Design a protein around this nucleic acid. Structure first.
Ligand SMILES: Nc1ncnc2c1ncn2[C@H]1C[C@H](O)[C@@H](COP(=O)(O)NP(=O)(O)OP(=O)(O)O)O1
Ligand SMILES: [Mg+2]
Ligand SMILES: [Mg+2]
Length: 424
DNA sequence: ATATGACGCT
DNA sequence: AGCGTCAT
């Protein structure tokens, strides 16, 4: 079995937060520009970067002041600030706009604020028998790249040349040629992407392949404003120089042990190993997953979920701003709870459901662990004061100070999350 | 002094 | 459950 039964696509917005600000502020269009959070510490932290500005080496996580050094024409748009914290509402709403449109073509799984996976298998079947064996016209694929093509014996001319070899080798006879199915999926994604641009003004990229992992890999091969098809046949060469860390779920500790333990560098080298070999190295689940994946085979299904299982608000208090007093802790819990009550009310009305669990998370000054304590209490009413007061209770026994007016050690992070939803 | 949401392990 | 891992 070759892991070619499904057509899966990943759609990801190009420099999402920038496009949202550029739609709103025409003066930012087609300029080096970036979106910044806060302002006081070193101009604010950069969180999204137009492609014009990336050409100067401006990146996410860079301070705005350091970014202006790399690029002094850089324009900045500031994230909105409510009750003393970053407020991402504009971008969540833009995301819903984009998800609604995508939903009209197939069932989607929201994977982040700006991307969704799409299972196109069923829509591919439909469009196939409508064609009645009609060949696929390169007219229908004006922004599609075929990975690994052209091959054998100017940016856009190279694209068409690869696209011509793909079609000129296609087998439109067999209505289950996996390569034909990917080509038809790619035709739908062009329609989906034109509709998103038409109805929002947002441009996006997309990957089309047989599973989530290849779709996501393909999406980033030709950003921005292009889509890439990765066929099962292109996987051996693609993977032969693909660093292991580029693959989703291997960008961290597991991927680094794969490199260290096996002494390899690229995804294609995993094929030498037996599945049993890989299970003893990395456990039974990772070994099986890896054995299949280095052959381009992956089974994670596209889950029909476009809303979330959790709604959270958090704020970091780094350095001098760490929370030292009880009354400081209570004020910020109030602020978090107020924004949280706002989003929960919106979610109970628009999507018809109610949370039953409140999770409270904190980080103390000196703990490397991104969260230090994580406790849960009942959630019965969408009332900020009640939520904020209950969060304090759950954490108040963690102020290790005999002075009760004081909070020690200082808190570096407050996090309030609502979960365990039920239909309402 | 790089705000969020999913899922795995035990 | 609470923690860890990984993602954008
Ligand atoms: N580590 C992070 N932390 C917080 N917000 C982030 C983030 N990474 C991204 N965002 C925010 C800002 C981002 O705009 C948005 C989508 O994340 P991406 O798709 O990873 N990056 P973009 O869409 O900007 O560029 P392109 O896709 O063309 O590479 O979510
Ligand atoms: Mg994006
Ligand atoms: Mg993204």
């Amino acid at each position: 079995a070759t892991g070619q039964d499904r057509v899966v696509a990943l759609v990801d917005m190009d420099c999402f937060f920038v496009q949202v600000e550029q739609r709103q502020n025409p003066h930012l269009r087609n300029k080096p520009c970036a979106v910044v959070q806060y302002k006081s510490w070193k101009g604010g932290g950069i969180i999204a970067v137009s492609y014009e500005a990336r050409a100067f080496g401006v990146t996410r996580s860079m301070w705005a002041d350091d970014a202006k050094k790399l690029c002094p024409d850089l324009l900045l748009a500031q994230v909105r600030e409510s009750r003393g914290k970053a407020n991402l509402t504009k971008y969540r709403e833009a995301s819903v706009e984009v998800m609604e449109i995508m939903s009209r073509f197939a069932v989607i799984e929201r994977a982040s604020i700006d991307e969704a996976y799409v299972d196109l298998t069923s829509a591919v079947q439909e469009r196939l028998q409508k064609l009645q064996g009609q060949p696929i016209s390169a007219d229908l694929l004006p922004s599609t790249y075929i990975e690994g093509l052209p091959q054998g014996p100017q940016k856009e001319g190279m694209r068409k040349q690869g696209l011509f070899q793909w079609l000129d080798s296609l087998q439109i006879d067999n209505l289950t040629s996996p390569d034909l199915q990917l080509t038809v999926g790619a035709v739908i994604v062009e329609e989906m992407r034109a509709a998103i641009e038409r109805e929002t003004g947002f441009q996006c990229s997309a990957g089309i392949s047989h599973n989530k992992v290849l779709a996501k890999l393909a999406c980033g091969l030709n950003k921005p404003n292009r889509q890439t098809l990765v066929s099962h046949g292109s996987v051996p060469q693609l993977f032969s120089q693909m660093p292991i860390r580029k693959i989703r779920s291997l960008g961290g500790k597991l991927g680094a042990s794969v490199i260290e333990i096996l002494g390899i560098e690229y995804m294609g080298e995993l094929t030498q190993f037996t599945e049993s070999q890989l299970q003893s190295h990395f456990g039974e689940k990772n070994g099986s997953w890896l054995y299949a994946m280095c052959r381009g085979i992956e089974h994670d299904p596209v889950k029909p979920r476009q809303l979330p299982k959790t709604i959270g608000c958090s704020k970091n208090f780094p350095g001098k701003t760490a929370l030292a007093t009880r009354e400081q802790v209570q004020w910020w819990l109030l602020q978090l709870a107020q924004e949280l009550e706002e989003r929960l009310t919106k979610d109970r009305n628009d999507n018809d459901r109610v949370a039953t669990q409140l999770v409270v998370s904190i980080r103390v000054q000196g703990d490397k662990r991104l969260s230090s304590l994580r406790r849960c209490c009942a959630l019965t009413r969408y009332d900020a004061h009640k939520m904020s007061h209950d969060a304090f209770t759950v954490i108040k026994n963690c102020n290790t100070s005999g002075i009760q007016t004081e909070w020690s050690p200082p808190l570096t992070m407050l996090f309030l999350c609502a979960t365990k939803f039920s239909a309402s």
